[PDB]
Write a protein that binds this ligand. Structure first.
Ligand code: CHL
Ligand code: CLA
Ligand code: CLA
Ligand code: CLA
Ligand code: CLA
Ligand code: CLA
Ligand code: CLA
Ligand code: CLA
Ligand code: CLA
Ligand code: XAT
Lengths: 98, 197, 67, 307, 42, 212
């Protein structure tokens, strides 16, 4: 519903070419103000497919691989190490982080 | 305020108003409200004394082991020779504990009864709630907000079980608490209660 | 280090693709079915308020690539 | 209980009429738990809590008011000529049956002699709607200046911006004398970096800091006299909080220029928390003169786009 | 089983169950700690 | 779609031509009217017995798996010296008594949460909430959940929910009996279950229980 309730219209559809904004504004030296152009900006309505359901969460079969891959990318991200048996320290690290 | 066993409901006598009210009364002890307001005080005092006790029998040990300061291990600390006797300490710890505990008794009997000094009658105490005196018991004046009271009761409930753990880790183990922690961190799956028995 | 970077990227951007497809299947209810609508990253906007676990998974993935 | 009379006459499903400390008051509740505290017989809104977060505590207080003083705090509409026209507290409802549970509307009504100021406060799930409409009856063209001054509290004082009045010229202009003020117009323009008369400056920043005292009206109503294109200022901006991640937007209908009022450092002398801003559209720098009998429509909508 | 739990709730059935459990408890304790005349655990 | 529709009265019974009892209408999965004694008379107790059957069957299924599959791997040459009825006596770390109390702690947490579900269904809820998303209220023993229904097979995706719960219960009753066979014929033969199978399949006539 509009901002006035039972005023300004019984509702308005077919809003016309309101260039003057119904202020009866007169024109100085210009190209044109009115013409043979009568085009009404007919807007759409309300109270129809009104819901527009916001994007809710997907089901368990989507989150469950994402949870397991979160557990992977937290578990692999810290891997006296297994660097040699399987197959500048602060400055370079803070330069890459910077 | 929360729940200790979600399958169970908080009883009607624990309305959540009190600090630390997780609804733990399976054995129906604080069913009468007088018993509830007495056991609030018993909890607070046993927990505060347990916090002081644990802090006075563990922090000596974590400083003895690392060598910052050598001090006895809370069970060989009685037999040490002090500047007084073994019983003179009990005499003083009777004289000037009877006075402070009976005044706390008069407080937890009627709240506004005992707040001014006998000697210096001007230096009264503010009208705080029972078990939380304030005033000179709050010199830094940290506020007694309900979150702070909950933190108090949580650390106190933890220190009570910590003291019980100390007594039973010296009764059927023979060693100190922190030594038992280092023994657990040495080999946790082989230095537990089910290896001693 | 090549194989270790392979492992961490192949477990990181896989999570990122599953988070992206969760974003896409959340957007399918808004825009209907169209890749210029339901895969357009411009009009996705913000989904922290709506799909939180997708947000956390996608964020841990993109921090896994951001170092 | 006059509010009980309004309840069994005009009260509806989302409309709750309240009467405590002999103050008539209504609370509007649309379906998503949006609270709106409209003080009745005053045309003055106290509180407004629409669902911002997606919790049960998604409602967040938008308007600034203190706990006790209902005359000092919140958005109140004001009409002057050049004295206060609607200071009489004869506001009464006219109709309430607007929509079931999704959108609500309380329209009030008074009479200032020649001016029949009926006044709409609507509650939509995303927006407060504040709508003024006057109606002349006598044979006198009144040269009135409407005013809807809102007071939007901000959680952190550093987080203040309007985001979108760039390009249009502004002028530091002291606000209207409201009975529901927070700061008087004498102290609203005192101890700033805009000068006291209507000096002109073009805003060259997409968002303005509201840290200083510098308070102004946006738009060029001296350009409005030309009735060319005249650079009509935008009817919308994104006021921000930045203490927590939410924002709001104000939309005017029928008005021309939009006032903001920055308390600066002088918020300490009345309140102590939740720094505010005195924001709203008026027809002030050029007033409105309706007719010897016509009606004028001017609406203002504060909306949120978080939900 | 309805009305069997009421029978097993009856005083003699419940007494024999309680005292059988209790007697087995005492019996196994006396197997574990036979010939007891003091409480030395403190 | 997800209603847990029961079985009809003209369902197959454990004993054809017999009258099913009135307390086994068919609301539970695997309802074939088996009640010669009638231990499920009280429905408030039959709910507990249905939960009992469900958990008993699930544990028996995991157990029969952990007995026969690892024995197949031992026959394939993966695990050494495998014998399930001597796999508790053999050596591990933690002495098998520290393992027991750690097991009791962790399973006490798990089965206590399940108990709190049984006493009061909504107490220990999981599958955390999402905006404008209504996680469906589950039943006792079939929590659904992100942790126990991540493939969303419980609400009735591949097959209806009743026939899937009946599949669980029937496969699991069979597993309960398989584990009873394990506990009995590993002590009256002092041998391996798969060995006993191949021994009976060698000569089904004379390699039966009556030989021993
Ligand atoms: C509370 C509290 C607890 C749990 C203990 C516990 C103990 N004290 Mg003890 N005490 C306590 C309060 C007090 N003690 C003492 C003074 C002593 C002494 C003088 C001795 C103990 C000893 C003991 C042990 C007796 C067995 C045991 C470790 C004995 C001990 O530690 O033997 C090695 C011992 O000689 N306590 C005082 C001051 C009067 C207390 C107050
Ligand atoms: C000095 C001991 C003591 C006392 C008096 C209390 C008293 C209280 N507690 Mg606290 N509590 C304690 C220790 C204590 N607690 C410890 C150690 C724990 C951790 C295990 C808790 C955990 C706890 C929770 C989580 C909650 C309470 C609550 C309560 C209140 C209701 C229950 C009651 O009346 O118990 C009376 C208790 C006793 C008389 C103590 C008997 C101790 C026996 C002798 C020992 C048994 C163990 C043995 C060594 C083996 C009451 C104020 C509830 C509350 O806040 O309500 C306001 C609540 O939610 N307590
Ligand atoms: C409560 C409480 C109680 C009853 C005790 C009691 C004791 N402490 Mg401990 N202590 C406590 C809290 C407590 N402490 C806390 C909270 C801290 C910190 C310490 C730190 C501490 C140190 C560092 C030492 C003691 C020592 C002592 C003993 C002598 C104290 C004295 O008056 O002389 C005595 C056994 C002394 C001791 O046993 O050695 C002589 C000692 O050196 N305490
Ligand atoms: C307050 C918390 C607390 C903590 C952190 C510990 C921690 C420890 N205890 Mg102690 N203990 C406690 C309470 C605690 N205990 C209590 C209340 C008792 C009396 C029932 C005991 C009785 C006890 C004995 C008899 C022994 C230990 C031992 C140990 C160590 C190995 C764990 C073990 O055997 O489990 C035993 C744990 C329990 C019996 C109960 C734990 C319950 C707590 C409150 C839960 C905390 C989470 C470890 C350092 C062993 C050691 O020295 O090494 C050992 O022999 N504890
Ligand atoms: C009333 C007189 C009387 C008294 C005082 C006793 C006393 C005793 N008799 Mg005799 N007796 C009596 C009558 C009596 N008897 C009669 C009438 C008969 C003929 C029926 C006998 C025939 C008899 C035989 C044939 C034997 C005894 C034995 C014993 C001893 C019991 C040792 C035992 O198993 O307890 C151990 C303790 C218990 C069983 C109590 C355990 C209780 C449970 C576990 C709970 C406790 C823990 C609890 C939770 C609290 C913990 C605190 C906290 C952590 C919560 C004890 C000296 C036995 C013995 O050793 O000879 C000396 C023995 O062989 N008696
Ligand atoms: C943990 C065991 C257990 C439990 C609690 C249940 C419980 C239930 N079953 Mg299930 N069932 C089981 C095992 C179990 N069943 C197994 C192993 C089979 C295959 C043999 C079946 C086959 C079956 C059918 C075909 C049907 C049921 C049905 C029922 C329901 C009604 C009966 C009742 O209340 O009995 C309660 C039972 C107990 C409390 C357990 C009995 C314990 C006593 C002490 C006797 C144990 C000794 C036993 C005879 C030893 C076996 C010897 C060996 C030679 C075979 C109830 C939900 C009916 C239903 O509606 O389905 C949902 C139904 O139609 N059950
Ligand atoms: C009912 C559930 C259950 C239980 C209680 C056990 C218990 C056990 N299993 Mg089994 N297992 C199970 C299910 C189960 N398993 C399933 C479903 C699979 C598949 C396996 C496959 C498996 C293998 C391959 C092995 C075990 C082993 C073991 C033992 C050590 C486990 C640790 O480490 C222990 C007796 C190990 C063992 O020591 O067996 C001798 C071993 O080698 N299990
Ligand atoms: C006096 C303190 C106290 C005690 C004795 C317990 C005891 C228990 N809690 Mg509770 N709990 C407590 C305080 C306490 N809790 C507090 C303060 C909180 C925070 C609000 C919780 C929150 C909590 C949850 C959320 C759960 C438990 C659970 C459990 C059970 C663990 C099962 C077991 O033995 O595993 C070893 C056990 C009955 C679990 C359970 O089985 O609930 C029924 C469970 O899920 N507790
Ligand atoms: C083969 C036997 C079997 C069967 C048919 C089912 C069937 C079912 N279970 Mg049960 N379940 C079983 C064994 C079984 N379960 C065991 C052994 C356990 C213990 C770990 C559980 C624990 C369990 C829980 C905790 C939950 C279910 C749920 C479900 C439902 C959806 C999942 C599904 O279709 O499983 C399909 C099964 C297979 C394809 C078997 C192969 C899997 C291999 C070994 C891997 C369905 C009724 C969920 C439910 O009903 O939600 C509403 C639920 O919450 N079950
Ligand atoms: C006060 C206290 C300890 C104080 C210790 C002090 C001063 C120690 C001092 C010393 O160490 C030093 C500093 C230095 C050493 O040289 C000397 C000594 C002297 C040795 C412990 C209380 C310790 C108190 C304990 C352990 C209480 C445990 C209570 C429990 C578990 C209650 C459970 C329940 O009651 C509820 C909560 C609710 C009911 O409904 C249900 C049930 C289940 C019944």
């Amino acid at each position: 519903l509009s901002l006035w309730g039972k005023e300004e219209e019984k509702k308005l559809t077919m809003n016309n070419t309101k260039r003057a904004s119904f202020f009866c504004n007169k024109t100085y030296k210009i190209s044109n103000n009115v013409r043979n152009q009568i085009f009404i900006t007919v807007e759409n309505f309300g109270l129809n497919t009104r819901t527009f359901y916001y994007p809710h969460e997907s089901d368990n079969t989507i989150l469950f691989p994402m949870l397991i891959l979160v557990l992977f990318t937290l578990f692999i991200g810290a891997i006296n190490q297994e660097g040699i048996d399987f197959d500048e320290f602060l400055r370079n690290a803070t330069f890459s982080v910077s | 305020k929360g729940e200790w066993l979600p399958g169970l409901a908080s009883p009607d006598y624990l309305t959540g108003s009190l600090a630390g009210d997780n609804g733990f009364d399976p054995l129906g002890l604080a069913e009468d409200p007088e018993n509830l307001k007495w056991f609030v005080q018993a909890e607070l005092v046993n927990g505060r004394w347990a916090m002081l006790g644990v802090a006075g029998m563990l922090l000596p040990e974590v400083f003895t082991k690392i060598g910052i300061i050598n001090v006895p291990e809370w069970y060989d600390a009685g037999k040490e020779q002090y500047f007084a006797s073994s019983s003179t300490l009990f005499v003083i710890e009777f004289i000037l504990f009877h006075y402070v505990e009976i005044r706390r008794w008069q407080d937890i009997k009627n709240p506004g009864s005992v707040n001014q000094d006998p000697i210096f009658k001007q230096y009264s105490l503010p009208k705080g709630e029972v078990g939380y005196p304030g005033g000179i018991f709050n010199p830094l004046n940290f506020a007694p907000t309900q979150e702070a009271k909950e933190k108090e009761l949580a650390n106190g409930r933890l220190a009570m079980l910590a003291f019980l753990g100390f007594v039973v880790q010296h009764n059927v183990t023979g060693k100190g608490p922190f030594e038992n922690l280092l023994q657990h961190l040495s080999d946790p799956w082989h230095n537990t209660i089910v290896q001693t028995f | 280090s090549a194989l270790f970077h392979l492992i961490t990227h192949a477990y990181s951007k896989a999570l990122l693709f599953l988070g992206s497809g969760s974003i896409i299947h959340s957007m399918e209810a808004i825009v209907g079915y169209s890749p210029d609508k339901s895969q357009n990253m411009i009009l996705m906007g913000g989904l922290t308020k709506h799909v939180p676990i997708t947000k956390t998974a996608f964020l841990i993935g993109t921090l896994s690539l951001c170092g | 209980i006059n509010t009980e009379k309004l309840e069994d006459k005009f009260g509806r499903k989302g409309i709750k009429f309240s009467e405590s400390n002999n103050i008539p008051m209504v609370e509007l509740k649309v379906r998503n738990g949006s609270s709106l505290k409209l003080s009745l017989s005053d045309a003055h809104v106290l509180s407004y809590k629409p669902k911002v977060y997606w919790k049960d505590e998604g409602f967040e207080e938008v308007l600034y008011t203190v706990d006790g003083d209902e005359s000092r705090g919140g958005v109140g509409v004001v009409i002057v000529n050049g004295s206060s026209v609607i200071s009489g507290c004869d506001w009464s409802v006219k109709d309430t049956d607007s929509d079931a549970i999704d959108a609500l509307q309380i329209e009030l009504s008074c009479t200032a002699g020649v001016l029949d100021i009926t006044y709409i406060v609507s509650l939509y799930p995303v927006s407060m709607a504040t709508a003024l409409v006057v109606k002349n009856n006598g044979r006198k063209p009144v040269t009135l200046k409407p005013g809807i001054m809102s007071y939007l509290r901000f959680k952190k004082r550093s987080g203040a911006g309007i985001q979108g009045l760039k390009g249009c010229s502004y002028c530091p202009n002291p606000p209207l004398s409201s009975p529901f003020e927070l700061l008087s117009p004498s102290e609203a323009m005192k101890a700033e970096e805009g000068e006291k008369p209507g000096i002109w400056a073009v805003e060259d920043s997409v968002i303005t800091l509201l840290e200083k005292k510098m308070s102004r009206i946006y738009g060029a109503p001296p350009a409005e006299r030309l009735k060319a294109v005249y650079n009509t200022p935008p009817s919308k901006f994104e006021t921000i909080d930045q203490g927590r991640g939410l924002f709001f937007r104000m939309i005017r209908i029928g008005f021309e220029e939009m006032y903001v009022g920055s308390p600066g450092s002088m918020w300490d002398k009345y309140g102590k928390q939740h720094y505010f801003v005195c924001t709203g559209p008026t027809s002030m720098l050029v007033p409105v003169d309706v007719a010897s009998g016509e009606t004028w429509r001017g609406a203002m909508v504060i909306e949120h786009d978080n939900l | 089983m309805r009305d069997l739990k009421t029978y097993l709730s009856v005083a003699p059935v419940l007494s024999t169950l309680w005292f059988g459990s209790l007697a087995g408890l005492l019996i196994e304790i006396n197997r574990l700690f036979p010939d007891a005349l003091t409480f030395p655990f403190f | 779609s997800s209603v847990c529709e029961p079985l009809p009265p003209d369902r197959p019974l454990w004993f054809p031509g017999s009258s099913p009892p009135e307390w086994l209408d068919g609301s539970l999965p695997g309802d074939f009217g088996f009640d010669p004694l009638g231990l499920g008379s009280d429905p408030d107790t039959l709910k507990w017995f249905a939960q009992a059957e469900l958990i008993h069957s699930r544990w028996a299924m995991l157990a029969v798996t952990g007995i026969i599959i690892p024995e197949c791997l031992e026959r394939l040459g993966f695990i050494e010296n495998f014998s399930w009825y001597d796999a508790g006596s053999r050596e591990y770390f933690a002495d098998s008594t520290t393992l027991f109390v750690a097991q009791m702690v962790l399973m006490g947490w798990a089965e206590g949460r399940r108990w709190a579900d049984l006493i009061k269904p909504g107490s220990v809820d999981i599958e955390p909430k999402y905006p404008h998303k209504v996680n469906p209220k589950p039943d006792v023993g079939y929590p659904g959940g992100l942790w126990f229904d991540f493939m969303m097979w419980g609400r009735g995706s591949p097959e209806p929910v009743m026939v899937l719960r009946t599949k669980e219960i029937k496969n699991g009753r069979l597993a309960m009996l398989a584990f009873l066979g394990f506990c009995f014929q590993a002590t009256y033969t002092s041998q391996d279950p798969i060995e006993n199978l191949m021994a009976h399949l060698a000569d089904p006539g004379h390699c039966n229980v009556f030989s021993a």
